Amino acid sequence: LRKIRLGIVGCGIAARELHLPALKNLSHLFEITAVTSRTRSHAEEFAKMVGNPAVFDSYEELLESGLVDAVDLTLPVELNLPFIEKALRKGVHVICEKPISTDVETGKKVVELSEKSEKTVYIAENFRHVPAFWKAKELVESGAIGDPVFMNWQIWVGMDENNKYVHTDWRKKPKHVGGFLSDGGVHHAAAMRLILGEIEWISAVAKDLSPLLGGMDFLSSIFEFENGTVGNYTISYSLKGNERFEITGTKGKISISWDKIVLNEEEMKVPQENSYQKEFEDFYQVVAEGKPNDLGSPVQALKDLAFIEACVRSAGNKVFVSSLL
Amino acid sequence: RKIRLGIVGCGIAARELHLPALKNLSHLFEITAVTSRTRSHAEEFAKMVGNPAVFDSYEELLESGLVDAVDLTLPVELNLPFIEKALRKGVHVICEKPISTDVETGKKVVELSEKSEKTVYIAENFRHVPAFWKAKELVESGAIGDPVFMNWQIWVGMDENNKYVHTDWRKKPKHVGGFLSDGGVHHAAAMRLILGEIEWISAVAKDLSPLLGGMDFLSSIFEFENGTVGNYTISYSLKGNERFEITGTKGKISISWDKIVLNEEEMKVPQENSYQKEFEDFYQVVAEGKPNDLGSPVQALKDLAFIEACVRSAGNKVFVSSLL
Numbered sequence A: 001l002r003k004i005r006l007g008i009v010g011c012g013i014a015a016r017e018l019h020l021p022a023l024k025n026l027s028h029l030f031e032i033t034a035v036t037s038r039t040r041s042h043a044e045e046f047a048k049m050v051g052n053p054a055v056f057d058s059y060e061e062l063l064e065s066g067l068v069d070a071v072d073l074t075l076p077v078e079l080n081l082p083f084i085e086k087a088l089r090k091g092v093h094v095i096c097e098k099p100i101s102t103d104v105e106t107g108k109k110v111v112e113l114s115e116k117s118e119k120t121v122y123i124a125e126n127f128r129h130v131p132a133f134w135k136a137k138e139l140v141e142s143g144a145i146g147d148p149v150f151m152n153w154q155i156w157v158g159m160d161e162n163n164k165y166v167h168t169d170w171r172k173k174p175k176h177v178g179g180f181l182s183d184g185g186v187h188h189a190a191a192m193r194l195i196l197g198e199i200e201w202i203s204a205v206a207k208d209l210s211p212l213l214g215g216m217d218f219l220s221s222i223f224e225f226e227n228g229t230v231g232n233y234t235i236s237y238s239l240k241g242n243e244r245f246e247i248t249g250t251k252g253k254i255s256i257s258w259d260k261i262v263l264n265e266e267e268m269k270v271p272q273e274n275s276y277q278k279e280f281e282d283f284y285q286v287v288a289e290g291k292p293n294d295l296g297s298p299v300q301a302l303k304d305l306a307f308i309e310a311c312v313r314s315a316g317n318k319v320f321v322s323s324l325l
Numbered sequence B: 001r002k003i004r005l006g007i008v009g010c011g012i013a014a015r016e017l018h019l020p021a022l023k024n025l026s027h028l029f030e031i032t033a034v035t036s037r038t039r040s041h042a043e044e045f046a047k048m049v050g051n052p053a054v055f056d057s058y059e060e061l062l063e064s065g066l067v068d069a070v071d072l073t074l075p076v077e078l079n080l081p082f083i084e085k086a087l088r089k090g091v092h093v094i095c096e097k098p099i100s101t102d103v104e105t106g107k108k109v110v111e112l113s114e115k116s117e118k119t120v121y122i123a124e125n126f127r128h129v130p131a132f133w134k135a136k137e138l139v140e141s142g143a144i145g146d147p148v149f150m151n152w153q154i155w156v157g158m159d160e161n162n163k164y165v166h167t168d169w170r171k172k173p174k175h176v177g178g179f180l181s182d183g184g185v186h187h188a189a190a191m192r193l194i195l196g197e198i199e200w201i202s203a204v205a206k207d208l209s210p211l212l213g214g215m216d217f218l219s220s221i222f223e224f225e226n227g228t229v230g231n232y233t234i235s236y237s238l239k240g241n242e243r244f245e246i247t248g249t250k251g252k253i254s255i256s257w258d259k260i261v262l263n264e265e266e267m268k269v270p271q272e273n274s275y276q277k278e279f280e281d282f283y284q285v286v287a288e289g290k291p292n293d294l295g296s297p298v299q300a301l302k303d304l305a306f307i308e309a310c311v312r313s314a315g316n317k318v319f320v321s322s323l324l
């Protein structure tokens, strides 16, 4: 099995804590041969965790070095577009973190570069690879609750001053639509779309409740899927509480968690998996083994972002999600 | 002295909800007159009361000189005309919710109320439920900090065995949104009592059950004038568990008939009959000069208006005041 020579770009939290451990479990598929960051010492610390990749002062040099088949971008979202374009111009595949971009108009440019290039652009939306969501999808699609009627997802993150993501520069002064609403919201849209399909319209109210979190941090919404199912999605990044994620149909109900699905009275444990690992496997198959790009698809990520961007601008008015696309 | 009260409409609410309450308030109410669409139902109800006078028609009961006030437990389409007839004879009216079939018609009830010296009390019993009062005081006293988000999810799960489902004026509803306004006005009342007036709603209404006349599912988002966001979702046909939660900057309450949970801590709510409480209030209004804060038609119109807005919405933003 030939390996994908991979360059890591942006050696921050995701790269160290989320990407590397997954990558370390996939060394039969990937070799990290190059590394670059804004702060050189950060790239050097990352190099040591990896082994001995070449360290570059700039991404453009990494791209031209001949050392890589693809690059992994774990950057401030403002950088996705120009950096994806640089990679494709050099004939290099890209796996890039969500959100696809800072907003939908910029996102669309990522999509068109993707569609015009022969190289793969893969937006790493790990919620598309979470088994609990797949299992919910299967239950729903096979008629286990009858016709889906209503879903509610309430999320209370309770981030405080000790949360590491809160202190990063590009989150404190967000350039992305809705601040934390897009940052974490694309995950939630990904999941709802996986389980129930495309959303037709939303109506939502977004608030900025914490001076600690850059931009908006509270969102409450109703929407309707194209299939007629009604959704409620409410989240506070700053306040505490218990997640509920429930789908009620004509014949019964499911509740969804990381570790289990409950179908009426019946518990089913979901065997645990690393979704980052799962997405890297999928990217490998897209790049090397000619698998279609369904789950890392730029178009999919753009649709995730569109849901959130619609909510941010709704101010309680009905927004048809298509009109953003 | 005691309020001479005539019962009009001897159906479910009259036998099962109203009479027991009055039987505990025999020192404040005497039932003297009774009338219904079916004379035999009125005669059965009379036998349950003692020996009141049975009348073939509302109009006759009103001219009989036997009552100071009437209690209307009727198809909602009849509220406006029956209230008007009573006020035009010098007779107080206690009338069941909803105030009317729709806001346009409701306003006519409000208008007649303000012009008469007699009381019109819309018996919205949810304004008399102690669980909501204790929740109000906790929120008002700053127990959870600034209120951020309330969520009320109701799954009534009505079936063929529920008696309300077989009543004619519910099967072919004339009232806005069918069951949505029938049960919804209660919920608006509780929401308004706890968090105050609502600025705007956005809502979707479905008709999911062939058994329930009219629309029977509703999901909505809205914002109180104080800034709190609300979600209110109800199905009248499907089963699930009620949650009623209000989250603030400092804490969390969860509300139930018998208890309020403040963060980790439970406080039992002492139980009461809300019908019994509302009749006492009506007694205090007509005999004791108590201002009509809790049974006032204006409050009942605002309840209906919340629900009417939600039915018109189709997902669009509706500013409630625009209906009033």
Ligand SMILES: NC(=O)c1ccc[n+]([C@@H]2O[C@H](COP(=O)([O-])OP(=O)(O)OC[C@H]3O[C@@H](n4cnc5c(N)ncnc54)[C@H](OP(=O)(O)O)[C@@H]3O)[C@@H](O)[C@H]2O)c1
Pocket (backbone or CB within 6 Å): A009, A010, A011, A012, A013, A014, A015, A018, A036, A037, A038, A039, A040, A042, A043, A059, A073, A074, A075, A076, A077, A079, A097, A098, A099, A124, A126, A165, A168, A169, A183
């Ligand atoms: N899927 C998920 O569960 C998830 C979770 C968290 C984050 N993410 C995504 O991962 C990406 C990074 O997030 P993060 O939390 O890791 O934030 P972060 O810690 O701030 O990481 C960003 C990294 O990029 C570096 N960088 C900034 N500008 C650069 C430039 N011009 N050229 C090269 N490197 C540059 C930063 O600078 P320094 O060199 O100075 O350190 C830092 O190393 C984001 O797109 C985010 O949405 C995804």
Ligand SMILES: NC(=O)c1ccc[n+]([C@@H]2O[C@H](COP(=O)([O-])OP(=O)(O)OC[C@H]3O[C@@H](n4cnc5c(N)ncnc54)[C@H](OP(=O)(O)O)[C@@H]3O)[C@@H](O)[C@H]2O)c1
Pocket (backbone or CB within 6 Å): B008, B009, B010, B011, B012, B013, B014, B017, B035, B036, B037, B038, B039, B041, B058, B072, B073, B074, B075, B076, B078, B096, B097, B098, B123, B124, B125, B164, B167, B168, B182
């Ligand atoms: N606050 C609450 O918790 C609550 C609960 C239930 C009901 N309610 C309200 O109370 C009212 C009564 O509802 P319900 O459940 O008791 O329904 P119901 O059983 O159908 O009661 C209506 C009664 O009025 C009679 N009636 C119909 N037209 C009449 C007319 N023209 N003249 C005299 N009587 C007439 C009916 O027919 P017959 O004489 O042939 O029997 C029946 O006895 C409704 O407005 C409802 O919204 C409130």
Ligand code: NA
Pocket (backbone or CB within 6 Å): A208, A209, A210, A211, A212, A213, A214, A215, A216, A217
């Ligand atoms: Na904020």
Ligand code: NA
Pocket (backbone or CB within 6 Å): B207, B208, B209, B210, B211, B212, B213, B214, B215, B216
């Ligand atoms: Na129905």
